[PDB]
Amino acid sequence: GTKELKLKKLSDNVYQHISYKRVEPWGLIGASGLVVINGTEAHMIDTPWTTQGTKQLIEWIEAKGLTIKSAVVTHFHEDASGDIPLLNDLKIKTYATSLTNKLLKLNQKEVSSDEISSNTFEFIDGVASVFYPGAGHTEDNIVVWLPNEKILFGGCFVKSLKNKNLGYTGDANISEWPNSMQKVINRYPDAKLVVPGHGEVGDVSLLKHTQALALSAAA
Ligand SMILES: [Zn+2]
Ligand SMILES: [Zn+2]
DSSP: OOOSEEEEEETTTTTEEEEEEEETTSSSSEEEEEEEEETTTEESSSOOHHHHHHHHHHHHHHHOOOEEEEEEOOOSSHHTTTTTTHHHHHHOOEEEEEHHHHHHHHHTOOSEEEOHHHHHHEEETEEEEEEEEOSSSSSSSSSEEEEEEEEEEEEETOTTOOSSSSOOOOOOOOOTHHHHHHHHHHOOOOOEEEEEEEOBBBBBHHHHHHHHHHHHHOO
């Protein structure tokens, strides 16, 4: 890959995009989203962390001859929603919940072109569903389920196993996070792969691990 963007194949139709940003004292650290390929159409789950990441990702997808039909952003932070303005200009439909758009507007950022106004939403017909579990990392965080591959994109709602803490909790609801996570655990007993917003992909233990971190941060 490059200094800004790496692509990892997760299945025949599913890629992990890993975009890099210098965050001292760590150096270049990564944020994860997905590209979901549905015939000649591609869909973005989260934008890369930097505009240069997003431009390189749009180039990689288009170089396969695919049309980027749409993007869904999984929360209002820059590592999920950062390049809404670039996608809106390129006329790539952006989907965000009413809560995500409220927090983008509160923070003087451009809202999505298209608003999710239900707790569950068919993002790609038969391929990608959005679920709002309640507050955790942020008030607005959503997860995306890929039923064909048994892949759950948890985003920054889910921590990697190695994480000893919840990360940036400035926008978090630590008391609600465990109950929100129980709804995700209860909903996807069939999840084969869980993709956190940062860190290594894993199994459902990442859900239980995040719930435990939240229960401990509360106590
Ligand atoms: Zn975040
Ligand atoms: Zn994040």
